[PDB]
């Protein structure tokens with residue numbers, strides 16, 4: 436019974452309360468198809484989880500003949516390396532920390548495959564190809580990471596991302612993006628929800644984040660749109676501890692799904 440850890444992140448993983456009898460409300464898609472849901476414990480009581488990643492998990496479990504139990508990451512984070520003591524060895528938090536500690540056997544979430552994480556865990560082939568993009572108010576046009584309003588910032592156009600995120604780290608390490616980072620570090624938000632709200636409230640002109648997330652957020656709000664070319668393209672993959680016996684088949688299934696329309700069907704169903 437594999438321990439699956441995930442996190443709230445629509446449309447990949449929705450999190451809702453169970454009904455009074457402890458079950459998940461029976462719901463259907465706009466075309467009458469049943470919405471598959473799994474019970475996921477977390478911040479701790481049983482809750483209802485569903486979405487792109489849950490549909491993927493259900494498919495993998497069926498295809499690979501395994502049972503599982505899902506829980507939401509305890510600290511509500513994806514995972515970054517942080518100094519937590521006087522030693523010289525940083526420690527991973529979020530889902531990365533849980534996978535490495537054994538609290539989880541697989542990370543099933545919109546987790547970016549990057550260099551730092553790849554140094555400690557292994558990933559399946561990507562179940563989603565995306566990259567960083569920009570969220571702005573309808574009518575605003577930004578070409579991409581090279582747009583002057585970003586490279587030559589001023590207070591007339593404020594942009595930012597989420598503090599302590601892997602995206603924040605991406606800019607902090609990009610020497611060529613020092614100018615941008617200096618500007619962002621002065622406006623970064625505590626959470627994506629807050630930043631997205633700030634964009635609708637005209638308090639923030641641009642929010643830099645995952646295109647896989649922003650494309651959905653934009654589709655849900657008419658006053659919001661994504662703009663420009665993607666930069667820092669990346670994939671989302673299932674995380675497992677090194678040398679896992681599940682890796683090969685998880686990867687083969689995902690590659691097969693990209694080739695047989697299954698992944699395209701999830702795209703249409705959830706966005």
Ligand SMILES: NC1(C(=O)O)CCCC1
Nearest residue numbers: 513545546547601602645
């Ligand atoms: N995909 C993210 C990650 O850290 O894995 C990047 C920002 C949202 C979460």
